[PDB]
């Protein structure tokens, strides 16, 4: 069972092809499972103070990878914790901040397999000495009026399971189309279809229903699980519920269509 | 053989502007005051320098 | 003004120097070798296992 994400109501006549369009781009799945769980945390600084100054990509780090400092000069100057992914801390350290280092830094984490990303901005204003060095909040970020000529630390720590390597059951995208018929309860609804990112497909009901009740052929290649119900019978009414699950990422989406069928007179 | 890119000049009417560096190869910049651009339609700005 | 020096090629050892010119006060000059990078040119011969 999947928690409520989208609920909808549909109405159609018997003998017509219904389309209960369930889709989730986050259910898109990569055929390559070679350490697909790669995480890249990188720091991007834009020096808005120096007019229109090209932003500098100071440092990259990859879970199961090195902390490559982009420019040879910044080596040593830019530092990120080596256990960053292990503990979730992705803060930066500038060993000796100077006027050249001033600007809005931005840490960005990217998860390839889930095709997910996050990021937060932190400003670094360089003041000559300690008489004007402090920290404050501008409204969307933390700003550090840093001590020129001394180490300054720009904080960001993402305390979430998505950015940690603890075992996650290596789950993959799965989908369950059920149909709570009139008088039936949800989560007991007779299963209509079952799909997995590996292409596993299961159909339910009489073969004619399976022919009429069918999900697209390349569901997970598109993140689509639209359910076609050809030549609707009035018994094909009820609450159709598509439960989309990806336990490795935490996806627990529910997409529901209350398809009530009608007949002529 | 190369080719010089000559992008349209950034004109500010009755205001002030400053140069900004870029990452393009051989990037060169320069500002000029007192400009008074004209076109087939006529003046594109209206203030005396 | 152009001014030359010989600096030891060792990281984390700042070198101090001046620049002498008549009519101007001396200006300090600090040189630091943050990090070296010796990269050679190579060609792949073959691969075994």
Secondary-structure blueprint of this entry?
The structure is cut from a larger assembly and holds one copy of chain A (265 residues) and two copies of chain B (49 residues).
Chain A lengths: L5 E8 L4 E3 L18 E8 L9 E7 L15 E2 L4 H4 L4 E3 L8 E9 L4 E12 L6 E4 L4 E6 L4 E3 L19 E7 L9 E7 L4 E3 L3 H6 E3 L3 H4 L4 E3 L8 E9 L4 E12 L3
Parallel strand pairs in A: 1-18, 8-10
Antiparallel strand pairs in A: 2-16, 3-4, 3-7, 5-6, 6-11, 7-8, 9-10, 12-13, 12-17, 13-14, 15-16, 17-18
Chain B lengths: L49
Organism (chain B): Western equine encephalitis virus (WEEV)
Subcellular location (chain B): Host cell membrane; Host cytoplasm; Host nucleus; Virion membrane
Subunit structure (chain B): The precursor of protein E3/E2 and E1 form a heterodimer shortly after synthesis.
Short overview:
Chain A has 265 residues and is mainly beta. Helix content of chain A is 5%, strand content 41%.
List keywords for this structure.
part of a larger assembly; 3 chains; A: 265 residues; mainly beta; 6-stranded mixed beta sheet; 3 helices; 18 strands; B: 49 residues; little secondary structure; 0% helix; 0% strand; flat
3D architecture notes:
- The structure is cut from a larger assembly and holds 1 copy of chain A (265 residues) and 2 copies of chain B (49 residues).
- By secondary structure, chain A is mainly beta.
- Chain A is 5% helix and 41% strand.
- Chain A has helices spanning 84-87, 207-212, 219-222; strands spanning 6-13, 18-20, 39-46, 56-62, 78-79, 92-94, 103-111, 116-127, 134-137, 142-147, 152-154, 174-180, 190-196, 201-203, 213-215, 227-229, 238-246, 251-262.
- In chain A, the strands form 4 sheets. Chain A has a 6-stranded mixed β-sheet, with no helix packed on it.
- The radius of gyration of chain A is 26 Å and the shape is elongated.
- Chain B is mostly loops.
- Chain B has no helix or strand.
- Chains A and B meet through loops of A and loops of B.
């Amino acid at each position: 069972s999947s928690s409520l994400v989208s609920e909808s109501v549909v109405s159609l006549a018997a003998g017509t092809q219904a389309v209960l369009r369930c889709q989730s781009p986050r259910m898109v799945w990569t055929q390559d499972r070679l350490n697909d769980r790669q995480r890249v945390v990188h720091w991007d600084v834009y020096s808005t103070y120096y007019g229109d100054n090209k932003m500098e990509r100071l440092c990259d780090m990859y879970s199961a990878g090195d902390q490559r400092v982009y420019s040879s000069y910044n080596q040593g100057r830019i530092f990120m914790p080596q256990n960053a992914f292990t503990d979730g801390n992705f803060s930066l350290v500038i060993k000796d901040v100077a006027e050249s280092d001033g600007g809005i830094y931005s840490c960005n984490l990217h998860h390839h397999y889930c095709h997910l990303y996050e990021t937060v901005k932190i400003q670094l204003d360089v003041t000559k000495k300690a008489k004007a060095a402090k920290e404050y909040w501008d409204g969307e970020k933390a700003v550090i009026v840093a001590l020129e000529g001394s180490t300054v630390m720009l904080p960001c720590v993402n305390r979430n399971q998505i950015w940690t390597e603890r075992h996650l059951e290596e789950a993959q995208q799965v989908v369950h189309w059920d149909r709570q018929l009139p008088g039936v309860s949800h989560d007991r609804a007779d299963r209509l279809l079952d799909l997995y990112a590996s292409g596993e497909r299961r159909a339910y009901g009489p073969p004619f229903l399976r022919d009429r009740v069918s999900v697209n052929t390349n569901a997970f290649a598109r993140g689509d699980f639209s359910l076609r119900i050809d030549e609707l019978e009035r018994a094909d009414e009820g609450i159709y519920s598509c439960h989309l699950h990806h336990h490795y990422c935490g996806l627990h989406e529910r997409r529901v269509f209350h398809l009530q069928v009608t007949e002529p007179a | 053989k190369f080719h010089t890119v000559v992008p349209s000049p950034q004109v500010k009417c009755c205001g002030s502007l400053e140069c900004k560096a870029s990452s393009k190869a051989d990037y060169t910049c320069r500002v000029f005051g007192g400009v008074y651009p004209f076109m087939w339609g006529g003046a594109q700005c209206f203030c005396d320098s | 003004f152009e001014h030359a020096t010989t600096v030891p090629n060792v990281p984390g050892i700042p070198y101090k120097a001046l620049v002498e010119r008549a009519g101007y006060a001396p200006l300090n000059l600090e040189i630091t070798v943050v990090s070296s990078e010796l990269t050679p040119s190579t060609n792949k011969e073959y691969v075994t296992c």
